[PDB]
Amino acid sequence: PVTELSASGPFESHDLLRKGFSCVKNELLPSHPLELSEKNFQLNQDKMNFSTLRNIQGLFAPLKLQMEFKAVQQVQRLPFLSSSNLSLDVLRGNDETIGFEDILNDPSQSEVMGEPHLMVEYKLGLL
Amino acid sequence: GTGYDLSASTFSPDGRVFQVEYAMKAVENSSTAIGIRCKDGVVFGVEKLVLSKLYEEGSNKRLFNVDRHVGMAVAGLLADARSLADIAREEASNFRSNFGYNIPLKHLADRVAMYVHAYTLYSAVRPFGCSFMLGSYSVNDGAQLYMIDPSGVSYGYWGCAIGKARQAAKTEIEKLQMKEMTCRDIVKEVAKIIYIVHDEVKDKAFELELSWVGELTNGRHEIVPKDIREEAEKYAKESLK
Amino acid sequence: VFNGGTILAIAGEDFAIVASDTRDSPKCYKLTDKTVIGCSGFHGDCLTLTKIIEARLKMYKHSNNKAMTTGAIAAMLSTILYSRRFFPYYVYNIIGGLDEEGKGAVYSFDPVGSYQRDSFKAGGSASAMLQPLLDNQVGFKNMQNVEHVPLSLDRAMRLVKDVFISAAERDVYTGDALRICIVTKEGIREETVSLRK
Amino acid sequence: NPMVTGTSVLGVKFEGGVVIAADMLGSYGSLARFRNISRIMRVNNSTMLGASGDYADFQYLKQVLGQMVIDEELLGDGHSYSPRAIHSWLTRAMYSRRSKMNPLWNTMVIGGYADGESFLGYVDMLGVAYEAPSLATGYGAYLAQPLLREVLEKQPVLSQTEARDLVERCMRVLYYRDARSYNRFQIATVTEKGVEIEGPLSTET
Amino acid sequence: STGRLPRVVTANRMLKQMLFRYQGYIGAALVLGGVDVTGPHLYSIYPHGSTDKLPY
Amino acid sequence: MFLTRSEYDRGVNTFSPEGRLFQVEYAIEAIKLGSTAIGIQTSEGVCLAVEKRITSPLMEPSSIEKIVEIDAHIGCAMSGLIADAKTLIDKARVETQNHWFTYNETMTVESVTQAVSNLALQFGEEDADPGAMSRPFGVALLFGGVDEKGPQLFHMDPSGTFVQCDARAIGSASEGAQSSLQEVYHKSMTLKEAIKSSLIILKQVMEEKLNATNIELATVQPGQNFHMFTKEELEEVIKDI
Amino acid sequence: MALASVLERPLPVNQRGFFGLGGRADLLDLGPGSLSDGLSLAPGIEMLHGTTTLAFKFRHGVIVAADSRTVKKVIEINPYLLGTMAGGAADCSFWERLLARQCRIYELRNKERISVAAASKLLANMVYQYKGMGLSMGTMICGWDKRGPGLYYVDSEGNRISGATFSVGSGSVYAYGVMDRGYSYDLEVEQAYDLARRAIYQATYRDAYSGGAVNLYHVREDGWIRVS
Amino acid sequence: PEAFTPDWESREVSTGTTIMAVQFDGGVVLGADVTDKLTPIHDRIFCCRSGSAADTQAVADAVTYQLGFHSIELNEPPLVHTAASLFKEMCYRYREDLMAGIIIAGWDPQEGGQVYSVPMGGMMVRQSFAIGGSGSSYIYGYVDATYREGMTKEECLQFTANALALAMERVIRLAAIAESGVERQVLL
Amino acid sequence: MSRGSSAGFDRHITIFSPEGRLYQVEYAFKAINQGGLTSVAVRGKDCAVIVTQKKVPDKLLDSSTVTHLFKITENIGCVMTGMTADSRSQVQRARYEAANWKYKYGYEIPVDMLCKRIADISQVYTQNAEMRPLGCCMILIGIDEEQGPQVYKCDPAGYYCGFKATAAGVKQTESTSFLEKKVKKKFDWTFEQTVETAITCLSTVLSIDFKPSEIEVGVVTVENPKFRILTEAEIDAHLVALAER
Amino acid sequence: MFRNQYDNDVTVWSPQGRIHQIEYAMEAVKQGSATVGLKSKTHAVLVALKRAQSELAAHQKKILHVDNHIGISIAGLTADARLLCNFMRQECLDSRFVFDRPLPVSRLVSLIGSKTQIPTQRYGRRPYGVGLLIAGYDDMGPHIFQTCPSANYFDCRAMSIGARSQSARTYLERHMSEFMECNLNELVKHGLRALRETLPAEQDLTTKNVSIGIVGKDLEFTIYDDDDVSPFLEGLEER
C-alpha cells in the first residue's frame, strides 16, 4: 500500500517499446535489503559528508564541494561512452581506494547500451 | 587590470583578482557604518540616509539582529547585505540546534566570511558587494567586534568603519580610548563620529541608527532606546559646532 | 468501526441540508457560500482533507477568476480521494449545496472517491438503521425524484429532527447539540439544535 | 516494537488562562531509570506545551519549536505564533511525519492565552487534533477523562485556584489508583502575565 | 602512495567499514593480525562490522 | 567625445540602459512576418478570420489551417512561427482536457489563455527546468471563445502575456487592419456585420483577392459550437462582398 | 542563494533548517495543500461494487444491457463510445474518465475519432500498469469506428478480448446462454434478445436493488442511444 | 489519548555488558564489565556501549571523527555536551535502524565531570550516575540507595567496583577521568 | 563573468600558450606575494619551526586575530602565505581532509599525505575551466613516527615537495639562498639552533631587527609532537638570546 | 564609453563598484504606468492607472489579489509580475495550511526580497523587471511595501511607482501628514489625486482607466474596476 498514485492527474505518458517490462506493483519494496543501500551509496556518502561539513564548518563547505563536483562532472564524455571520472575521484577521495563497484560488473563493458542521441537527450532532461 | 577583470576566477598578471577589488569599491559606494568595542560591550552606529519622507521610519534598516547575542551592521549593496544577514542567522540557528549553546562570535564570523569567500571563487556567481560588522557580548567571552569584507577576510577590531567615509571615521575613532569606556560614553562618541564624517551637502538629511550589545543589555543585541539616542544626537550636534 | 458518525444530507428544490451528530468528531465545515462538506472518518484524515480542499478552492479561484461550483468541488474531491487509492483516506464524505440552476445538490463518496448525486443520503453507522425508515418516510410514494425531495425546508428540518429522534432505538445517538448546516440562496446557515435527551 | 503508555499529562481551562500538569517520569517500561525529567515546554509568552510519549521526539520538537520562537524574536516585526498557530503547526507536523513514516510518537496538550481567550488543544502522533475545556493524555487518560468532563459540565467556568485544585484531584486519583511515586509532577499555568512553571511539587499524602 | 608499510589499524578500519556497509550479508569473520611501527596488533572482525582488539 | 558600439540585444536576459529587453521585441517583429489574423468579439459571438497564404496549388489547404479548435467553445487564430504555435495550441488542448477530467466542466476562455501564458512566459532561465524554451515563442495567438461570461476574445504575444480585447489584428498588416477596426467596430454590432468587417479588412490588407480558398473564417456563438466556415459558406459570405 | 541555485540539487543541507543528518529541513515535512491544483498533471476499507451485464455486436451496431437500476452500471464514455461496470465502482469510473480524456485529446489532435481497438488498448495499458495492486475492473468497451461496430472486453488483470458476445456478472452463465443469436438480427429482434437475457437472469428475482428494467442501450453508427 | 510509545529497550537485548558511569567531584568513573568496553571518544571523553556491537562502534567512530574535527575548528577542548549531542543526533536519526545505547562520560574545563546518558531511542539526559544493559535490575536499586552526591575519585572507584561486582555476583575494568587525565584501572 | 572561457594565452586556466605554459597558474604564484609577508620553515634534528611576519598596520585592529599559523590536526601546523581568505579556506579544506583520513584509515594523517591531498585538489583546480587556483602557499610541519620532523610545501600549481628548510612570500629567493648556505655547513640543529636559524633568515633577508610582536613562531618537537605557537615572552627570550650572541 | 565591458551581465562588477544590469532593471520598472499606494490608520489602498492602447482593448490587470489580506500593484514587465504573484500566492497558501493564520505582510515581503535577490548574483539570469506596491493588513495594522528589481523593499507611509510617478510622490509628500486619520473615502480620494498628478493637464481620471484595491480592518482585499470605481471618483474636485 504505497498511496501516491499521483492519480489526480495520472496523465503521464511512457514509451511502450522503451519502458521494457516495468512492474510498479513490486517497485515499492526493494528486492534485497542491500539493493538501495548499494544503488545510492555514493549519493548517501556525499550527503553524510556534506552534513558533517555543514554542521562543523558551515554552508560554504558543502557548497564548494558540490560546486567542484558539478564542475568536474560536466567536462566529461557523452553518456553512451564510458568516462574515467579521474578528477571527480580525486575530489571525492576515491583515487586510492577500490570498492566493489570498481571490480564487479564493469561499467566499461556494459553488455547493453542505448542509442547515442536518446541517451544524450535523456541526460539533458528532455526524455 | 583591464582584460583580466571580468571574472572572479581570473588572475591579473600580478596575481590580483580584480572583480573582488571592484566589489570592495562597491562597498565604498554607500554611507558609513562604525562599530566601537568598549570595556563592557559593542556599539554600532549607521549614517542612514533618508531616501524619502514617504518611508515609514525603521525601513531599510542596516542594523540586524543575527542571533540573541549578535548584531550586524552592514554597508554596500543592501540586497546583498540582507542575504548575508539571512546566512548569518541560519548559521547561528544551525549551531544552536546542533550543539545546544550560543555560537561564539569568532566562529560565526568565520562561517559567514568563508561563505563570502566562496563567492569570490567562481565564474557562476559574483562576489558580494557588501561589507559588514558583527558584534557580541558574553560574560565568558567579553565584547567582540568583527568585520568581514567582500573578499572574505574577517579580522577582529577595537573600532571599525565601513562605507564611504571609512577613512575619516577611522581617524576619528583612533582618538577614543575605547578600551576603558562604557557603552554609554561610547554611544555618545559614536553619534559624534557619525555626525562628523557626514557630508552635509553631497548627501542630505540622514538619521542616526544606534545599537548596542553589552552588559547593560545582559548580552542581548538591541536598538539604543529612544531617549539615549536623543541624548547622543544632541551631544553629537552640539559638538559639531 | 469508529462509530459516532451519522451524516444526513437532504437536497430540496432550492435548499440543501447536512446534519451530523457530534460525539471527538465535529464536522460539516463550509467550503463556499453554496457548498458544505461533511466528513465521517478518522479525524486526522478529515482535517488534512478539508485543508487540502480549502487550498484547492483558493487555487481554483485564482486560476479561474470565480468560486468553484458544487459539482466541480465534487469532481475535484473524487480525484483527490482516488489520489490515495492504494493507501486510502479513511473518510466518508458528503457534499451538499446548490448547483448553478439554484436547485439542491447532494453528493456522497467512498473512501476512494466514487460519487453520485443523491436526493438524500445517510452516512455512517446509524445510517444503515435510519435509512429505510426515513426513505419510505421522505418519499411517501415510489415516484423517483432522483434529485429533489418534494418537502419544504421547514418540513425537511422536521424530518431530520424526527429521524434523529427515531435513532433512539439505534446506536450511540449522541444527543450532543445536533449540528445542522443549511444551504439556501441566502447563504450557509449553521443551526445546531440540541436533541433533547 | 512493544508499545507502552505515555506518561500522564493533564490540563483544564479556566477564566484567565489554562493550567497544565505533567508528572515527571521517563517512561513506564525500561526507561523508568531516567527520572526527574520535565515534559513541559514553554513555547513563548502566550503558549505552553505538555507532552506525553517518546521523550526523544519531545526533545526534537522542543528544539524545532524553540528555534522557531527565536527566529521570530530576531525579526522583531510584531508577530508571534499564537497558541492556535502552534497547535496547527504541530498537527501538520505530526500528520506529515505519520504519512512519511519517520515516526513522531508524541501526544501533546497545547495550552495558551492570547487576546483574552484561553486555548486548550490536543495533538497526537496520527494527526488528530481538537479543542476541549479539559484534556488528559497518558496513563490514566480514561480514568481522569470522565472526572474532568463531569466537573466541567457541573461548572463550565473556573478560576486559577479551582482549576489547579481539580487538576490536583485528578493527579491524586491517578496516584491512588497506581503506586508510581508521583513526587515527580509539574504544574504549569499560562495567563496574561505569561507562562509560569513551578518545578517538582511533591505529594505528601 | 605513502611509501610506508601499512598499519594494522588501517586494515581493521577498511574491513570493519566494508563489513558494516554490507549489513552482515558478507559472511566473513576474520582474525586480523600484523605488526607496524606501533607494535603487534591482533583484531577479530565479525560479519556485521564489529571488531575487537585482543591479545589472543 | 566618441561614438562607440553598444549592443544589448544579442542575448535574452539583458536589459538595455533603458529598461528594455530587446530579444522579446524581436520576437514581436517575428510575429509581423506571419499572415494577418483578425478577431472581433461581439455580443452574438466571436469571429476569427485569417489570411491563408497558400504557397503552392499542390499543397493541401486543410493542413495549413491557421484557425484551430482547442475545445468545442474555444478557437485559436495563429500568426508567426508555426512550430511554436502548435506547441502552445497543444498546451491549450491538453489543459482544457485536464480541467474537464478534474472538475467536470468546461474551462473558461480566460483560464485557457492563462494556462497557455504560464507555458509561454517561461523562457530564459534554461538551466532551471530542462525542456524549457530558452527564447520567446515567436507566435501571437487569438483565443476566441464563449463561456459563462458570454463571447470573449483574448490576445497573447511573444511575452506569455494575455489581454482581453474586442477587435484585434495580428500578423503582417496588423497596424493597418487595427486602424480599420478602430472605426468599423462599435460595441453592439451583429455577428454577420463582424464577419462582414473582418472580410472587408482582410480584402483591404491582402496582396491577393478574396476567393474562398485563400482565407479562413471561424466563429463561436453562444449556442452553437466552434465552427469553421466551409467552401460554400465562405463563398456565400464573400459574394456578399 | 546564487551558489546553491547554480548547484540545482536541491538537497536538504544546501537549504535552511538542517541541524544534523537532517532536522526541520525547511518545515519539518509540513508543506501546502499542493503546489499545483488539477487542470494540470498532479485506511478507508469500504469501496463499492457491481452486478450483471450483456453486450453483443450485430449487423446494425453493438447492444449493451444491464440488470436494471439509483446505482450506475454503464459508463457513458462520450457520445460515440460506451462501457460497462464490474468490480470497483471508483476503479471503473476513474479509469474510463481518464480514457475519455485520452479519447478527446486524440480527437482534437487528429481531427478524427479514436477507434475502438485503440480506445480499449489505451484502457488496457492504463490498468495493466497497476496489475497486482488491487485494481478491480471488468469493463466492456463498445463503439463504432471506420471498421464497423466494435466490442472489446478489457479487464484489470491485463485481459483485452475482442468478441461478438460478452457477459459479466451473476446471471452471466444464464445470460450468455439464452444468447442464441445471429450476426444479422433485426434491431427490434436484438433489443428482444438482450431484454430476454437479462430477464433469464432475474426470472429468479424481480425489480429491487440492482433490479428494475434492463437499462438497455444501443450503439448506432452516429453514437449510441438509450432504447429504454 | 493513551500516547502509546515504543519501548526502545525491550526490542532485542537478551544480554548485557552492564555498563555504568558515576559522576564524582571534578571527574567521572565509567567502569564496565580480555576485551575492552570503554571506547575513548576524545582525550577526556569516554563512552560505554550498549546494543549491537557493530552499530554502536559505527556511531562511536563517527562521533570520534566529528568531535575531533569540531574541536580543531573551534580551538578548544571538546565539551562532553558536544560529544553527547553528536551521539544523540545519530542515535535518534537511526533509531529504527540501529541497536545502540550510549553512556557518555567525561570532563571539560567549564563543566567538569558529566554523565550524559543516551539510551536506546536517542535521548540526552544529564545524570549524576548512569547504568546500562541487563543492569536495570540489580544495580539500579542499590545505586539509588547509595550515591552520596559528592564522592571523591577513590570512593567513586570503590562504589562503581562494588556495583559491577554485584553484577558479577548475579573482570571489572574502570577508568577515572579527572582534569589531570584518565587513570584506567583493571579489577577482577 | 557568467560563463565561457576568456580567449587569450594567459587569460584562462585551461588554455596553453604556444610554449605550453599555463599562465594563470603563474599569476596565482604572483598572488602569493599579495600581502607582502615572508614565511620561513626550518627542519632540525628533532623539531620543525615555522616563522612568519606579523604585520598589523592598524592601531584599531585587534592584533590577536591576525595570524597566519594554523592548526590542521593536533600534531600538524601550517603557515599560510598569500591571499588571506584563500589561505583560510585552504586551511579549512586541509582540516576536513585530515579528519576524513583519520576516519577512513584509523590513524592520524602524516604531513606528506596531507600536502599530497591538498596538491591533488589544487591540480583539479588548474585543469578545469570553472575553478581557479588559490593564491596561497601552505607550508606544513609535523613529527611523523619514524622519519622525524617534516616540512612540506604545497603550492598553487598542485606541486608539493618535502624540504629541510623552505620559504614562501616576497623574499622567498633570498631566504632560500640564505638557508642553502646554512644547510651546507651543518644541519643537526638542536631546537634552539633551528629557531635561531629561522629567525635569522627572516631578519636578514628583511634586514629588520625583530620585536616579539612583529613575528610568529610555531613549533613541533619530537618530545612534544603537538603543534605549539610560542607566546610573545618565548619569542622575546629567543630574540634576546640571539642578540646577546 | 568605458562602460561596455561591465554592463552586459549581472555577474560583472564595474571598476566603479556598480552592477549595471540592476540599474537597467530599475528602468524597466519606470517603463510601466503609475500606481499609487497609501495607508491610513485602518486601511491600505492601491490605485493604479491602466493603459489599453486607448481603445478596443480591456485594460491591463494592474492590481492583483494575493490573499484575503494582501494585494499587489505592478509596474514593469508583466511576466515577472505574474511569476512573483504566483510565488506570493503559494507562500500565502502555505502559511494558511501549516499555521492556520494569515502570513504577515513583512515576512512575505522578505521572502520576495530573497527570491528576487538570487537572479542579481547568478549567471544565466536577469533581475526581475517588475516593481510592486504591496498593500497588506495583519496583526500590526495596514502596511504598504515597495519592492524593487534590485531586491530592495521599503516600508512606506505612501508610495508611487511607475512612469511619471515623481509627481504623485511630490503630492504624497506634501499631503502625508493627514493620511492617517482619513476615512476610506477620502483616503482613496487622496490616492486618486496623486495618480491624477501623474497625468497631463488635459487628461482626467475616468472609470475606464482607474483601478482601485482596498484592504483594511474589516475589508478583505477587494478590487474595484470600470464601474465600481464610480463612487470613489464622484466627489473628486477638478485639477
mmCIF file of C-alpha atoms in Angstrom, chain B residues 101-179:
data_model
loop_
_atom_site.group_PDB
_atom_site.id
_atom_site.type_symbol
_atom_site.label_atom_id
_atom_site.label_comp_id
_atom_site.label_asym_id
_atom_site.label_seq_id
_atom_site.Cartn_x
_atom_site.Cartn_y
_atom_site.Cartn_z
ATOM 1 C CA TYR B 101 24.504 26.818 23.010
ATOM 2 C CA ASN B 102 25.035 30.258 21.537
ATOM 3 C CA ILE B 103 27.510 30.304 18.665
ATOM 4 C CA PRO B 104 30.808 32.030 19.503
ATOM 5 C CA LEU B 105 31.186 35.245 17.565
ATOM 6 C CA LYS B 106 34.575 34.282 16.161
ATOM 7 C CA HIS B 107 33.103 31.059 14.795
ATOM 8 C CA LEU B 108 30.106 32.894 13.343
ATOM 9 C CA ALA B 109 32.423 35.386 11.678
ATOM 10 C CA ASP B 110 34.456 32.530 10.206
ATOM 11 C CA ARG B 111 31.382 30.780 8.820
ATOM 12 C CA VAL B 112 29.966 33.889 7.168
ATOM 13 C CA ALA B 113 33.354 35.114 5.927
ATOM 14 C CA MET B 114 34.005 31.739 4.353
ATOM 15 C CA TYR B 115 30.648 31.982 2.570
ATOM 16 C CA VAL B 116 31.614 35.401 1.187
ATOM 17 C CA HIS B 117 34.938 33.992 0.079
ATOM 18 C CA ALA B 118 33.220 31.051 -1.638
ATOM 19 C CA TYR B 119 31.506 33.609 -3.817
ATOM 20 C CA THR B 120 34.863 35.148 -4.690
ATOM 21 C CA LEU B 121 35.913 31.897 -6.412
ATOM 22 C CA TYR B 122 33.686 31.033 -9.385
ATOM 23 C CA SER B 123 32.580 32.406 -12.728
ATOM 24 C CA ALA B 124 28.999 31.390 -11.932
ATOM 25 C CA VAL B 125 28.408 33.903 -9.120
ATOM 26 C CA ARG B 126 29.789 37.316 -8.420
ATOM 27 C CA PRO B 127 31.470 38.490 -5.213
ATOM 28 C CA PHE B 128 29.274 40.088 -2.600
ATOM 29 C CA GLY B 129 29.390 43.838 -2.919
ATOM 30 C CA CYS B 130 28.724 44.272 0.754
ATOM 31 C CA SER B 131 30.803 44.519 3.915
ATOM 32 C CA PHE B 132 29.526 44.119 7.445
ATOM 33 C CA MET B 133 30.472 44.025 11.108
ATOM 34 C CA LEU B 134 29.404 41.575 13.792
ATOM 35 C CA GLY B 135 29.375 42.427 17.465
ATOM 36 C CA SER B 136 28.523 40.387 20.536
ATOM 37 C CA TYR B 137 28.948 40.253 24.291
ATOM 38 C CA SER B 138 29.169 37.266 26.603
ATOM 39 C CA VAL B 139 30.167 37.124 30.253
ATOM 40 C CA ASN B 140 32.612 34.308 29.491
ATOM 41 C CA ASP B 141 33.984 35.967 26.327
ATOM 42 C CA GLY B 142 33.867 39.751 26.729
ATOM 43 C CA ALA B 143 32.970 42.166 23.991
ATOM 44 C CA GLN B 144 33.865 41.108 20.465
ATOM 45 C CA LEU B 145 33.816 43.020 17.181
ATOM 46 C CA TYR B 146 34.492 41.532 13.748
ATOM 47 C CA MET B 147 34.473 42.975 10.242
ATOM 48 C CA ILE B 148 34.111 40.888 7.079
ATOM 49 C CA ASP B 149 34.738 42.472 3.682
ATOM 50 C CA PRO B 150 33.749 41.264 0.195
ATOM 51 C CA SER B 151 36.948 39.239 -0.256
ATOM 52 C CA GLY B 152 36.134 37.035 2.724
ATOM 53 C CA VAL B 153 38.714 38.463 5.113
ATOM 54 C CA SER B 154 37.445 38.788 8.670
ATOM 55 C CA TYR B 155 39.557 40.305 11.425
ATOM 56 C CA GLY B 156 38.772 41.366 14.973
ATOM 57 C CA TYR B 157 38.655 45.067 15.695
ATOM 58 C CA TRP B 158 38.568 47.547 18.523
ATOM 59 C CA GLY B 159 36.933 50.107 16.278
ATOM 60 C CA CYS B 160 35.848 49.711 12.672
ATOM 61 C CA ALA B 161 34.311 51.889 9.995
ATOM 62 C CA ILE B 162 32.925 50.625 6.698
ATOM 63 C CA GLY B 163 31.444 52.648 3.888
ATOM 64 C CA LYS B 164 32.080 55.886 2.039
ATOM 65 C CA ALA B 165 33.850 57.769 4.841
ATOM 66 C CA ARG B 166 35.643 54.856 6.483
ATOM 67 C CA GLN B 167 38.974 56.699 6.461
ATOM 68 C CA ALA B 168 37.751 59.879 8.143
ATOM 69 C CA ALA B 169 35.723 57.869 10.639
ATOM 70 C CA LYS B 170 38.755 55.687 11.336
ATOM 71 C CA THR B 171 40.793 58.809 12.024
ATOM 72 C CA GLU B 172 38.083 59.958 14.433
ATOM 73 C CA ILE B 173 37.797 56.588 16.210
ATOM 74 C CA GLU B 174 41.532 56.406 16.889
ATOM 75 C CA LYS B 175 41.235 59.368 19.271
ATOM 76 C CA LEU B 176 38.968 57.357 21.585
ATOM 77 C CA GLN B 177 40.381 55.366 24.477
ATOM 78 C CA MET B 178 37.680 52.791 23.923
ATOM 79 C CA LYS B 179 39.449 50.084 25.912
#
